[PDB]
Amino acid sequence: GSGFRKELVSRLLHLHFKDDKTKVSGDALQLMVELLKVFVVEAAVRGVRQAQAEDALRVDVDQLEKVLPQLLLDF
Amino acid sequence: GSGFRKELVSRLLHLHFKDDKTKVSGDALQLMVELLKVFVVEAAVRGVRQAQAEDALRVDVDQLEKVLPQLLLDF
């Protein structure tokens, strides 16, 4: 399946570090590539379950908003 | 004004520590007193803002329940 490129994740993390000396080990970077994936898939699948619980025909932003609060509390 | 007693906060914490050796410094304890007050004030203030948005007479538990996910995200 698909996934985030290491170099994109690195750039996303570095966009936000307060300190220029902060670095990320190679293993830690690979783990964050997997973590971001699981975050996205969790959001999508939870959105699917909500839309189904509402007898809806597609996942709309209105279903996604109901799942986001527990999603962010888990992550 | 009002505040939590340090002795009480010590007891609350010690109920949940996974390890029997875990101790808390005297300054850390005093700072936890302030943090717990901030948590309660934040809950109350968010509950008031939600009761105002819904044109209520008071903060009722249904209003409080709506702000809890976002409160918990901040703590």
Place this chain on the structure above:
Amino acid sequence: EQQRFSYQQRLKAAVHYTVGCLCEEVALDKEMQFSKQTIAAISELTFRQCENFAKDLEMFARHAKRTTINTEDVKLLARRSNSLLKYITDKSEEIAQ
């Protein structure tokens, strides 16, 4: 004489009392009253949140190879919001006085 109320019962009642006084201050300041049931729910929330605070503080101390929790651990609890972090980083200094 025998103790009448059990240990966590007495701790929840002491939390309830303080939460009540805090909510009384917010109600005067913000000009809006709280139901009794709201105040009880905030007190139960507060009691429950100490489990999460406690367990984080202990993992955070352990991350720094410590068994004694210090003010650095506590500051990490307030990290998500800059306003909370600055407010708790402040109060930390006032205690030092």
Place this chain on the structure above:
Amino acid sequence: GSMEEEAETEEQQRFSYQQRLKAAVHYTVGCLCEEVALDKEMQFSKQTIAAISELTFRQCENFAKDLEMFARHAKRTTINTEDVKLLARRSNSLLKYITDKSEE
């Protein structure tokens, strides 16, 4: 070639870089959502995918700040797998998954 003209050009460069980062996140989010949609036979709106992509971009901000703070807590300037395990500490589910992948 005034200071205010230079500041404007630098802001434009920061802005377009952020936008390119957001685009690249949106791309991959679209790919993951397409795999979910086929697997679950449930369609996603274009607005839902955009919302997930903006959420993933924001979540990176909180992941990065936490990681840096956890490393520094341990007096390290290099973020390691133990800092990443601390991100997942509230969810036993997530922690086991991350701990699994770390044994590789």
